[PDB]
Design a protein around this nucleic acid. Structure first.
Lengths: 98, 107, 80, 90, 18, 95, 92, 98, 78
DNA sequence: ATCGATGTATATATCTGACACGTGCCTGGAGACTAGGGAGTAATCCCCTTGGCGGTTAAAACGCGGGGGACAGCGCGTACGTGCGTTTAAGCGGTGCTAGAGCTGTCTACGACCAATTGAGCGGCCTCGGCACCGGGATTCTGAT
DNA sequence: ATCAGAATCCCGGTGCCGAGGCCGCTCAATTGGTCGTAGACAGCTCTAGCACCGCTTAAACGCACGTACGCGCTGTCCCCCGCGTTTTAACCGCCAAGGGGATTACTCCCTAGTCTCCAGGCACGTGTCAGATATATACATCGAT
């Protein structure tokens, strides 16, 4: 066994600066959300827009996770619960969480 | 006609005076623009970029890198409290979160 | 298979590790996908309206940064 | 069209041994646009408040003193005053 | 001109997960 | 004259003057004040209707700022529009 | 003189309710609200016209501005109100 | 005699609309903060400005308190702690609460 | 004169916010956050008035500073 | 099961100052007309996106055990709500003062506008070295022993 | 304590491609000069904020008490995490088609601009009624009967 190795992984991911989620499913999700509501066919996405949107989404998610984890350890437990995240979204504000 | 020297030379600055004057003219912020206002704008922009580049170059030298990367900007902005207050909701591309450990430790 | 299922459990797990989370639950993998969909939809709505205002059949990174600037959480790097 | 040349000039001013990446140049360019946008918008609304159709040196000075927090506002006003009193040489 | 009939969602925000 | 050409209540001349003096653009079109008048009329009508319903619910014909606060908070989109502003003399919602 | 929007608020109030009234305090609230919303819509239209190298504020600009600024079904009613109004204005 | 008056007090205060804090100490606090930046001279205040300031102050404080009370109810107790409010400031953001 | 903000005053603000029980250290903590909030707002307002040629701080500059800050106050502006 | 006084709701009257309407005056909106350029439009081009295929290869998916983490209960203790009496400074009202907002009048220095000129900045072109990758070795902890 | 097993640190080697410097072109900044007008400035006046005084009284303060509440501990149970194995599909590399962004040129209608006229909207005044408020009554009620 290699116990307590997760902390080093956390340090690595704080050290790294690359995108965490892959490119193809996020791009397909972008195409699907596009054709889901625009009521039009064949809307093209430039290359920089995809990677920019992915970087922004990962930034928003990591901010939400660090805030939620702080308020969970404030509550008295080290496990993140979805009720805490939903509470976090409305405790941040209209522009900060939504 | 005398020598057409740049207004950044007579003002002792490095940012262009004519570009920002034309930009304020086409910016539609007001109908009239003063003469010293673009000079003031150039000076404060020069001070801001110099102020961030000081710690940027220091952190780059600390990282044993002779070339500035956007990671160093992300690490330098989140160190100064004033610049952190100014750039609070600003997200930097290819900039990871500031390395901080939790209150619970291993020993 | 739904495309939102493409956001794998290790992907959100690595997101949480970068966020500083040690232990994660089970419903996290179902709620985070929903909030990511909501956030992305709110951005993409502003972006596609920005495209539709002009005579463009395609989106670009300019509309994306316009959408994030409109929402407040601006993003640098692609403004030129 | 970018402010990249002046960025490299002031970078050579602060450090003679440090390079810079191309993405960082775009970061700096967008940052300059953002700062200029916010300062100019505040200056415009503050000049419109007092029924004055011009943006003189007072407007931008009080605008940057309103925007910039901490001890950076006093350095901004010192640089601005020094620059505008050095400009009155020609 | 029909006037919109409103309803109260479980969570205050207009966006609803479904 | 040609004031109430759009059949609305807001004046086309005042909003046109405000757009020309606000320096939002070099030139301004002609349908834009009409469109602005329509949207301002619709929003004001909605908020005054909700305030009137709240005041009728409170058995008062003189709408007080508390009634406007209830009219804004009882709806769901109005708070998303006015989340960044607040109302003077406005109490908090009855939890 | 002083510029205000009191008469138009009073007209639409008496049109939607022929009995109710608005206090003087609430009247100022409505005036400031109208000014704030008008400034928001105007700033949005200004930056959107700047983003497409256009010096004119057409009906397309204001519609796109009010759609990306007003969320919800109120936007879908407001666009119909504006289009109906401009057709009514140009129908002379 | 009236036992358990907190419930009646909350039910009354959520229906009232007048400002709670007195005017004279609030005005004195405004004067004390103002005299640190007027370069020695005294600044005058209008009758509407002080009231608007007090309205904004009580509104922001009641928002901060209700957000903090949500956070403390998430913790599982009925008493709120000052550390919880201190956390709530940075949870809402460095510009909204801080 | 910061002691004017009484213990029942902060208590009534909390009761208006819905708080049932309040610990004893809140009244020494609410004064600091209120003091820095008012410090920030009055700083911005006095800068607005220093721009103006007038020396009295009017309500227009106050709501201008609040609009810059992010919380626009109705009922007085205009 | 009746009476008192403590708290709760409503019905009445009463009075007031805030509302609404009326008048009178005027400055901003409308009407008519012009000249010019911003924008609509059509044709063309070529970059950039889409799309499809093969071949790898890290990464995702799946299963399992165990431990450590959440949670319920209980007991201990303590800190804040409640009541009572005492006290203070906020508040009403009222009066006087003047600093300073705010308006008006004047005049000029500043900024728009235009024509001519040129070099600072942009597009492109190149070339090389700082940095990424990799591989061997050197050191340094750490749980399994 | 004792160990190899990872883990980190460093180090020479290659390499490659993106950074940085150079060259040529050109259009936007600069210079000079004229025109007009927003704004600087000064003076004058009349509101409104400031200061004070004196009386009232409702709110604040303190203090004793009690009991509801934080919190530490324990014990149980379970739900993630690590680890190994299996299996997918994202990623890279390639070319090929074309859609649409982008550019250029043409024309014309729309909108700024000016003058001239007048009425919708401003300020002011003043009568009146919705609502705040005081008192009475009805109602739940809790302590004495």
């Amino acid at each position: 066994r290699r116990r307590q190795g997760w902390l080093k992984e956390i340090r690595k991911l704080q050290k790294s600066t690359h995108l965490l989620i892959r490119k193809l499913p996020f791009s397909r999700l972008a195409r699907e959300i596009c054709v889901k509501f625009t009521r039009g066919v064949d809307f093209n996405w430039q290359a920089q827009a995809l990677l920019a949107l992915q970087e922004a989404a990962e930034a928003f998610l990591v901010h939400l996770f660090e805030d939620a984890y702080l308020l969970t350890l404030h509550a008295g437990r080290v496990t993140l619960f979805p009720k805490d995240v939903q509470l976090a979204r409305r405790i941040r504000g209209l522009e900060e969480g939504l | 006609r005398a020598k057409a020297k740049s207004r950044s030379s007579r003002a002792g600055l490095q940012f262009p005076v004519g570009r920002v004057h034309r930009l304020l003219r086409k910016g539609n912020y007001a109908e009239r623009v003063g003469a010293g206002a673009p000079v003031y704008m150039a000076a404060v922009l020069e001070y801001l970029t110099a102020e961030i580049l000081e710690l940027a170059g220091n952190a780059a030298r600390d990282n044993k890198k002779t070339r500035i990367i956007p990671r160093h900007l992300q690490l330098a902005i989140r160190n100064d409290e004033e610049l952190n207050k100014l750039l609070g909701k600003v997200t930097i591309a290819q900039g990871g979160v500031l390395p901080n450990i939790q209150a619970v430790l291993l020993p | 298979r739904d495309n939102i299922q493409g956001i794998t459990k290790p992907a959100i797990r690595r997101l949480a590790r970068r966020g500083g989370v040690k232990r994660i639950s089970g419903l996290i993998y179902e709620e985070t996908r929903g909030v990511l969909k909501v956030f992305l939809e709110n951005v993409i709505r502003d972006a596609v309206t920005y495209t539709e205002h002009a005579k463009r059949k395609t989106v670009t990174a300019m509309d994306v940064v316009y959408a994030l600037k409109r929402q407040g959480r601006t993003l640098y790097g692609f403004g030129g | 069209e970018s402010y990249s040349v002046y960025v490299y000039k002031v970078l050579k001013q602060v450090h003679p041994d440090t390079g810079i990446s191309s993405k960082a140049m775009g970061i700096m360019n967008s940052f300059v646009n953002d700062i200029f946008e916010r300062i100019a918008g505040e200056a415009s609304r503050l000049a419109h408040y007092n029924k004055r159709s011009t943006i003189t040196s007072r407007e931008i000075q009080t605008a940057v003193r309103l925007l910039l927090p901490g001890e950076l506002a006093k350095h901004a006003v010192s640089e601005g005053t020094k620059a505008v009193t050095k400009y009155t040489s020609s | 001109k029909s006037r919109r009939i409103s309803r109260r969602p479980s969570d205050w925000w207009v966006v609803k997960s479904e």
